[model samples]
Target: HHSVFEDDLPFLEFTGSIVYSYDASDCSFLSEDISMSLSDGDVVGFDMEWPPLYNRGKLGKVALIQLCVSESKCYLFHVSSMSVFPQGLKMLLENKAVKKAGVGIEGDQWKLLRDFDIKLKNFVELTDVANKKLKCTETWSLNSLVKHLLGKQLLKDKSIRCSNWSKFPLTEDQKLYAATDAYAGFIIYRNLEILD
Candidate 1:
């Protein structure tokens, strides 16, 4: 079995509103294409963001939602400009059938529920599950986990550090960071499945 870190891992690059569709009520967009891929058993890597702690719930809105498929293509969904979310995406969030894998899926789930009235059921937290299965002593950040398990160093530059998801035409760095998160996870998942 091949792992996600294997040289043959698939990669997809997505740009501009591929997944995030406009929703008038929420004044944002959701990514339905990525969700469709996930529903097809394509291991997805995902991330989210809200306002800083200083702003708290008052200003904390779902800014960015990033998704990566098994392939290298990454989709960055800008949530601020749309008014209606894609139906496929809404199903992915509300459906309990498909599995969602990530490091901190709980937090993301919380954000989805709080902000969008969405509830997620199927999920796999790579960090927690990896710790239980690998039984190794080390930091469990996504970057660290990737380095430890897949021997790949994920790039984490401050320049792309958490931008405003509400803004359209995301910067190159931000897009890279978003895509990298999912790519790294895809690698980890592939690796772990073989180990099992």
Candidate 2:
């Protein structure tokens, strides 16, 4: 992936350096990486990405992982790329105190273990939590939750969702797209707490 970005607007506008800047394959002591702030029962807006294709046989594999800690910025990890597996990630995933919350978390836990040999602990299913709070059985997408709780709508940029996450250099649209989704998870978690 070479540098090319349309001056496109994201779901929300933000300006900053992507945590890794380049694809984060290196375990090279990620400075200020989100893992440093994680502990038991710590809230994390978790999401994962893989190359999308119609073929089912080629699906369910993962590439990039976004861990949102605060201020809507997420730490992106390029595990699918050829790089040293970050031991810090293993520590965070396996920590009993870390609550990695998201939609379809169990499926993701299984897939993550298969792809990264990292077992996730303390996985929080947002659907179950939402059911307890909102007492509704409706399906939970981050979009739905955001609109319902925050009264805000986000553009579902399906092209970036379908793009190749394994590409070495990700586009600005892709990066911001991923980061904003994490923040969606972040805000949803905050609202869920208020409802508690």
Best by TM-score: 2
- The Cα error of candidate 2 at residue 98, in Å, is 0.9
Per-model TM-score on C-alpha atoms: 0.73, 0.81
The alpha-carbon lDDT assigned to residue 153 of candidate 1 equals 63
lDDT of 2 by residue, 1-196 (tens): 4443322233543243456433343533552355566555668778888887434564746777777777636777766664656676777778777777787878889888877788999888778788889988988876666666766666566788788987877787878877766666766777797884
Query: What global local distance difference test value does model 2 have?
Result: 0.69
lDDT of 1 by residue, 29-145 (tens): 234444544544445666665434335536567766666665546555566555644445566656555566678888788878877777766667887668767876554777667
Clash pairs, model 2 backbone:
40-97, 41-97
Clashes per candidate (backbone, < 3 Å): 21, 2
Q: Give the residue spans of candidate 1 off by over 4 A.
A: 1-42, 51-59, 137-139
Candidate no. 1 TM-score = 0.73
Model 2 poorest ten-residue lDDT run: 5-14
Residue 130 error, candidate 1, Å: 0.6
- Provide C-alpha RMSD values for all models, in order: 6.8, 7.2
Error of 1 at 189 (Å): 1.4
